[PDB]
Each structure stands twice: as C-alpha cells, then as structure tokens.
Design a protein around this ligand. Sequence first.
Ligand SMILES: Nc1ncnc2c1ncn2[C@@H]1O[C@H](COP(=O)(O)OP(=O)(O)OP(=O)(O)O)[C@@H](O)[C@H]1O
Ligand SMILES: Nc1ncnc2c1ncn2[C@@H]1O[C@H](COP(=O)(O)OP(=O)(O)OP(=O)(O)O)[C@@H](O)[C@H]1O
Lengths: 216, 216, 163, 161
Amino acid sequence: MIRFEHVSKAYLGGRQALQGVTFHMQPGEMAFLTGHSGAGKSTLLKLICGIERPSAGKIWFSGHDITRLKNREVPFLRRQIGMIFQDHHLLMDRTVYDNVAIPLIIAGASGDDIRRRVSAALDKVGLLDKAKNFPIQLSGGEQQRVGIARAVVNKPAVLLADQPTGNLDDALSEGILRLFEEFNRVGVTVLMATHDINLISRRSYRMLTLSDGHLH
Amino acid sequence: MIRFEHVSKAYLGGRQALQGVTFHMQPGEMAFLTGHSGAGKSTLLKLICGIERPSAGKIWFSGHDITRLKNREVPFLRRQIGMIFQDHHLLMDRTVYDNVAIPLIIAGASGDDIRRRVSAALDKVGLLDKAKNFPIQLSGGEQQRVGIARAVVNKPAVLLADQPTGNLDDALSEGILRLFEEFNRVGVTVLMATHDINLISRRSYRMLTLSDGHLH
Amino acid sequence: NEQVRYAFHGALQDLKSKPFATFLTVMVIAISLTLPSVCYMVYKNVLVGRVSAMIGVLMVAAVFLVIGNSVRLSIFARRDSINVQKLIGATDGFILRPFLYGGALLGFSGALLSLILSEILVLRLINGLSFDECLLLLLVCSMIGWVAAWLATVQHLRHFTPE
Amino acid sequence: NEQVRYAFHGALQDLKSKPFATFLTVMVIAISLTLPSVCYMVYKNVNVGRVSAMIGVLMVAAVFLVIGNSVRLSIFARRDSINVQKLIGATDGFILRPFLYGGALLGFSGALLSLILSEILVLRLNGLSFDECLLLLLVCSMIGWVAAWLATVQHLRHFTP
Ligand SMILES: Nc1ncnc2c1ncn2[C@@H]1O[C@H](COP(=O)(O)OP(=O)(O)OP(=O)(O)O)[C@@H](O)[C@H]1O
Ligand SMILES: Nc1ncnc2c1ncn2[C@@H]1O[C@H](COP(=O)(O)OP(=O)(O)OP(=O)(O)O)[C@@H](O)[C@H]1O
C-alpha cells in the first residue's frame, strides 16, 4: 500500500522536517510512529494524504505514484483515507451529526443509509447522545472523538491517526486503540503517530522512530 | 489563595459540569487535577479565571470574592494569573515574539525590559531560535510551548495549566514539570489538570479527582 | 438534483445565522441600486444628455463593486470551512455551489428591496418601472452576485493547495 | 503616548496584510463619494426644490452605509484576536484603539481617492475648493471612526461571561 523511497521534505525557509525517509507498509498492517516534538511526524502523515508534496523521492499509494498528482485527482485519493487530525479540524457551524455525515454526503449516500451509518459511528466512540450539539458545546476529548468518528464512518482503506489519544484518559485511549484494532482485523491499514509509551508498550506492533527527520 | 464553597456549574441546556465542589489551596501550593474525559476540569479552571460564572456557591481568589465580579475588574483579576489553554489560543497573524510579549505590553513595560524578559522566557521552553516565526510555521508541541512561555513571562501569582503536556513527549513533559516546580519554589500556586498518570506517579503532590462533576 | 437542495439549504442557513450582517449588507445594495432607477425614470418621463453619458456609467459601476465586496468578505470569514472540506476529499464544484447561491440570493434580495424603495419615492412625488424592467434588474443583480461569489470562492480555492 | 504607536502599527499591519482586499474596500468608498462631488459641482456652477432634496439625502445615506459595512466585516474577520487579547487581561480601551485607527484610515483613503476621481472628471470635461476637500476628508474620517467603534463594541459584548 504505502511506500516511501528516499523521501525528503524542506519547507519554505530551509527547515528540513524530513531527510531520506524510506519504508514500506503492506496492506492491512498496523504500526506506530514515535518521536520528539518537532521530529516530523505530522509532515509524514500529510505527505501520505497528499496535503503536502515531497521535495525529493517518490511516494506510492496503493501502487499508484502520487508524487506529482494533479489537483483534479487529489479528492479521489483523499476519499479512501480516514484521517484524524491533531487540531481536529471540525466545522464549528454545523452539528455533530452533520460533521460526521459530510463524508457520506460527499460520497452520495441515501438518507436512511446516512442515518444508520452515522448513528453506528457515533455509538462506537460513545457520542450517540451528543449528535445534536455543536462542537462548541463539547470538551476537547469529546471533539477529538467527534473527529475520530468522522474518520471511521466511510470504511477507509488506510487510517492515518495524528496523536488521536491526547485529551483522552487511559481507559478511552485503550478503547480507541481497540476500535482501531477491530478495524484492522478486516484488512485496513493503520499508521498511528503518537508519543505515549504506556499505551504502546502493551502491544507488539511495528515501530517507526523519527529523530530530526531520520527514520530507524 | 483559591477557595471553593459549594460551587456548582450548569450550562445552557441542563448539562451540569460541576456539582458541589469545595476545596482550598494555600499560597505557593502545588496540586494535580484529574478525571475522565468530560469530567469538568476545564470548567473548574475557567471558573477560577473568571471566564465562566458559577451557577451556585462562592469562589474566593486571594481573599477577594470573585463570584460576582464587574466587567471593569475582570482584566485586573486576569493579569495576576498565567493561564495555559487546551487550544493554545494564539494570534496566528503575529510572530512568536509578539505573542509572548503581549502581556508585557498590556502591563506597560519598556522596550529593553521586554527584549530581555521575552528572550529569557523563550529560552526556558527552548524556542529562542523561533522568536521570529509565525505560529503557522510551528508544530503542535511548539505552539503549546509558545502558550506556556506566554504564560510564564509576567511572573504570575497563580498558574492554571490545562494539560500542558499533550503534544509533548516524556522528556519535554518532565522539563515542563520541572519548570513549573522552579516557579513554585518562589511561592507561585500551581493547579495543573492532566491526563498523564505516569507523570504524576513519580512525584508526591496533592491529588484532586473529578468524576461527573464531583470532587473527592 | 440531490446535491442542489443540500447546497440551497446551506446558503439560507448562513444568511439566517447572522441576520444583522446580511440585512446591513442588503440595505447597502438597495440604496446603491435605487438611485440609478430614479435617475432613469426621471429622464424617461422627461444637448445635455451627452454630458451625463459619462456620468451615468458611474452609478452602475458602484453596484458591481458593492456586491462584489459584500460577497468577498462573507467567504473570507468562512475560508476555514473551505479548507476542511478540501481535506476530507470534496471536489471543487461541491464546495462552490453553496457560495454561488448565497451570492445570487444576496444580489436578488438587494434588487427586490431596491424596487420597493423606488416605488415609495414615486408615491411621494410620473410612472415607475415596468414589470419587464423590474425582472431585468433582478436578473442582472442575480448574475452580478453569482459572478462575484464565483470569483471570490475560486480565489480562496487556489490557496489551500499542495503546490 | 507609548501605546499610540503600538496601536498605529497594528492598524497598518491589518490593512497591509491583504492589499488586494483593502484596495477594493477603498475603491468602493471612492466611487460612492464621487457622485455627491460632481453633483455639487454642477449645482454650484449652474446656480426642482423637492426633486433633488430626496436625491441629495440618498447619496449621503450611502457613504454612511458603505463605510459602516466595510468596517463591520473587516473586524468580524479578526474577531478571534479580540477574544484572545481579552483572555490575557487587556482592557476595553486597549483593544479598541487599533480598530478605531483602522476605521478612520479606511475612510480617509477612500475620500482622498474620490477627490482624485472628481478632479479627473473636471479635467476630462471650476470645482471643489481646498476647504471642501478638507471638510469631506474630515467627515469621512469621523464616519469611519464611529463605524469602527460600533463594530468593536458590539464584538466586545459577545466575549463576556
Ligand atoms: N507550516 C510550516 N512551515 C514550516 N515549517 C513547519 C510548518 N509546520 C511545521 N513545521 C516544522 O516542520 C518540522 C516538523 O514539524 P511536524 O509538526 O511535522 O513535527 P512533529 O514531530 O509531528 O510535531 P509534534 O510532535 O509537535 O506534533 C518542525 O521543524 C516544525 O516546526
Ligand atoms: N461550551 C459548552 N457548553 C455546554 N457544555 C459544555 C461546554 N463545554 C463543555 N461542556 C460540557 O461540560 C462538561 C465538562 O466539560 P469540560 O471540558 O470542562 O471537561 P474536561 O474533563 O476538562 O474535558 P476533557 O478531559 O475532554 O478535556 C461536559 O459535559 C462537556 O460536554
């Protein structure tokens, strides 16, 4: 699914977030991405999504070279990916229901199907009672769970999590990790960027460590 | 300093975030605030700062009843407190230096004093080489540390930190805790809401647990 | 057809959310549109016209800029929602349709209020605009709003790109 | 005296950050003010009673509306920075000064540009004097000041407990 070949990324200003990152993740595989602050983890996750473009190397997604994707096929790439952001990127002017249902509206689903799937996704993260509220009327952990539910509603092929357990206690973090494992049991690829060792020490997964934009 | 007497908080719609919380903190004391997601921690911290108004009970800050403060006295209360937010509440259109220096400008300090104090504060959180950058050009942990530096630059009487360790790894979390202890060594009160059981396990401080708006 | 109704409700939900800002926006368009209409009708009912032919173009130029400015600043306050939808994987047209309709109804509402103002002025102190003239004014204002909304939304669109 | 410069610098930074948006904001106010200028010029040189009084108020009613609306939306775009500065402990007067100076400048540039446009029309085909120019500039600046004050005050009553 995911391949990096000598991937480098330099922003406008000379601050190199990455330097020669190369790895490979087979379909349905799960892994952890770790590092210090400023390491370059979110830059890697964004380079996967096509939000940013690498300064060098090649990125392959599902066997298709997305190094130089045109602006017209980017949404078709981003539709197969369920992305959880670090600032949660919500729509503050729409309800929780509309926020979670917008991927299905973009997809073109039916009303009954949308209702059923949004109810199920909200029930997974324990936010079924909070479907009519606006994101202002929620907590930080609740808003993060709204973003998670929005991510896991359209049955993606690849999951990209950008520290999805911050603002969540140990019980909720373990529950969210169990939800991601449940999704991975059916062939979904997961890449979870985080820096809490307590959660990742009790499960043996592939390890990706980032230090000043270098992969080990 | 901080005193709660039978405080209650109910939002618009009937959601009670707190119920009968009462405690007291002596000057220069350091403590932790914990709970599950949605417990009511940020509501408590906001009630201390005067951002929210209690639905019942009384709140005392430095011996002055602030449960019914007039709008003309709120800035004089909030100048004495260094608050760290969960969203980091930065000004995206100003540089890091201006963001850190704005409390001094509001206070009315001279140019050279501003230069010296802001440079020292940015060196405390390890962001001195990023004083000219904009918050868009910063990572999540760096933006959180910018908020921290803005908080600890004006030599406050009380520190209200709300999880200032999310987006920061274990080493940086330890450094931030040591910085807060360094500030508490001169008589600064610290009340820190956190989700990190490992961080609070290795040091013995007062423990305040919140469950569905109830204090233990 | 299914997505047209979703976009139409999206435009009204914004306009209803901030009624004062919308009403103040429309009230500017009605005032800027009611002057050319009185000047046209007083000339129609009644060599100096060639000396005002270069000034008649001045009043009509204001309405192009007022509506264009009005829609531009509305989309700017919502430039965050454009970024969020692009991240999810929405196409360019999907984002565009809510904004095109809101600009069109903004110009249409101003032109409709403009006609009401012109009639009141006539009743104070001659015949007013005909039905065809009213329809033409409404259509032209709607097209102006549509074009302005398209321009502003496309300008904000080529900002959240990987480049 | 120490905060006037800081308020003034912030006012220019907001306008200079988006030159394309600010200039178009300036350009509409210039067009609206040109109409009273030429109409007053013609009436001054030539010279019904109740056939221009209702017209005269119509153009002057526009400049209040065009200036007020332009300041209304510019402040709405930056209403987040009002909340952040209010949390730190800034007073109402501290926040109000940068917005007041932006309102007065916005009208001043628009009135100055309309003076140039009216001068071009006279050259293209006797006009306003220096006193009239100064009066128009002062009136537009006063309107911009009041518009900025109203918008920022209404935004301050929103971010309150
Ligand atoms: N918009 C930007 N422009 C330029 N440099 C940026 C930008 N955003 C981040 N950076 C820089 O790129 C590098 C990597 O940042 P990134 O956020 O990817 O790291 P990270 O390790 O995921 O951070 P964190 O652990 O704090 O979430 C850092 O030097 C960071 O300051
Ligand atoms: N603006 C708001 N309006 C109404 N209810 C709110 C608002 N913000 C939070 N709440 C509710 O108040 C309660 C306490 O939320 P609060 O964010 O204070 O808790 P918390 O324990 O600090 O959260 P977290 O652990 O997720 O950071 C919850 O029921 C929450 O949904």
